[PDB]
Every structure is written in C-alpha cells, then in structure tokens.
Amino acid sequence: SMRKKIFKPEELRQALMPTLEALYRQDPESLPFRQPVDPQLLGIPDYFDIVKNPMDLSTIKRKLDTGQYQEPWQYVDDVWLMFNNAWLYNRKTSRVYKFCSKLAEVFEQEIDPVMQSL
Ligand SMILES: CCOc1ccc(C(C)=O)cc1-c1cccc(-c2nn[nH]n2)c1
Ligand SMILES: CCOc1ccc(C(C)=O)cc1-c1cccc(-c2nn[nH]n2)c1
C-alpha cells in the first residue's frame, strides 16, 4: 500500500530546522529575508499590493518552533512562497533578487535529501 505518514511537530522541527538554518547561515544573502518586509521602513508602498501573502525566515522559524506545520509540504510551501515573493517584487538586476536565487539553490540542495528521509 501507499500509506500517508503521520508527522509530529517536534519531529518536523528536528528534520526541517537544519534546512532553514542553512538559509540563515548564508550571509549576506539571508539578511533581506530574516524579518518580515516592512514597506514603510523600506519605502516601497506598493509591496503589499504586489505581494499578497508575505513570508520570511522568522515566520517560518516560529512556525517550526511552535508546531504550526502539520505536514512537511506546508514548510516547503512557505519557503518557496518567500522566494517567489522576492523574485516577483524585486527586479532581476537587484541585490535582493540575486540573493534570493542563491538561497533557492541552497534550499533545493538541502530540502531534497531531508524530504526523502521523511
Ligand atoms: C531566528 C533567527 O535564527 C537565526 C539567526 C541568525 C543565524 C545566524 C547568524 O547564523 C542563525 C539562525 C538560526 C535559525 C534557525 C536555526 C539555527 C540553528 N539551529 N541550530 N543551529 N543553528 C539558527
Ligand atoms: C534595501 C532594500 O531592502 C530590501 C528590499 C526587498 C526585500 C525583500 C525581501 O523583498 C528585503 C530588503 C531588506 C530588508 C531588510 C534588510 C535588508 C538587508 N540588510 N542587510 N542587507 N540587506 C534588506
């Protein structure tokens, strides 16, 4: 049979937190992603029009710590949401877009063997 595995939040934290840590350890590349974008402080008033579902590393980390992910796919979705938001909002020539691309390469490398082990 093809059984759907049940995951406990503390098990997801142990398995998935290292993949998030790998993003945070990229410096300077993770710096734009460590806290929610504040459009007022960054002077980008159109941000929340373009980005309907903001996401950032601090939110993902707190969701892992506090057990808000029932399934690993939800964590993976939040990470790709964060990256796709940044590629959407920022220009291809921009520092943040290029940092995003680096983080996404790191994430793809880290998430695949972890998800295979899960
Ligand atoms: C909430 C802010 O989190 C961070 C901030 C900065 C940095 C840096 C400087 O690298 C790392 C984290 C972070 C994140 C998740 C896991 C871990 C971690 N878990 N076990 N070892 N490291 C470390
Ligand atoms: C100067 C333009 O900032 C941004 C533009 C877009 C976005 C996003 C994620 O779409 C993020 C930031 C941002 C936010 C906080 C810190 C930093 C930062 N701190 N050190 N280096 N970069 C960069």
Side-chain angles (χ1 to χ4, degrees), residues 1-104 106-118:
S1 72
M2 286 183 72
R3 329 187 288 248
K4 190 57 196 75
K5 207 176 173 185
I6 308 301
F7 303 97
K8 303 174 181 178
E10 63 275 16
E11 296 175 334
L12 293 186
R13 187 187 193 260
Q14 173 149 249
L16 299 171
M17 188 73 75
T19 71
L20 197 66
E21 176 193 344
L23 305 183
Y24 273 99
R25 293 213 179 263
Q26 302 307 307
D27 190 321
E29 290 88 351
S30 71
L31 300 178
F33 302 90
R34 288 181 179 188
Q35 290 295 321
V37 167
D38 187 319
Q40 185 59 31
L41 296 180
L42 296 172
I44 50 178
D46 61 349
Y47 185 81
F48 289 151
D49 192 31
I50 292 165
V51 177
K52 288 181 176 294
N53 193 184
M55 186 53 53
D56 72 292
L57 294 168
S58 71
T59 300
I60 299 170
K61 207 268 186 184
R62 184 177 61 253
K63 289 171 76 173
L64 279 175
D65 281 341
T66 64
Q68 293 184 50
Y69 296 121
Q70 307 185 233
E71 296 249 77
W73 77 261
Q74 299 172 305
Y75 165 80
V76 171
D77 188 80
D78 271 349
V79 175
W80 289 111
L81 171 62
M82 172 178 55
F83 294 150
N84 277 277
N85 286 345
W87 285 319
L88 183 68
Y89 181 76
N90 298 279
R91 298 186 78 85
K92 244 189 188 304
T93 52
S94 74
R95 175 174 178 277
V96 171
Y97 185 111
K98 291 170 184 294
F99 281 9
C100 187
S101 295
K102 171 62 177 178
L103 296 179
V106 172
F107 186 66
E108 181 172 294
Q109 296 173 8
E110 300 283 350
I111 196 56
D112 288 355
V114 169
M115 293 294 280
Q116 189 174 112
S117 65
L118 291 173

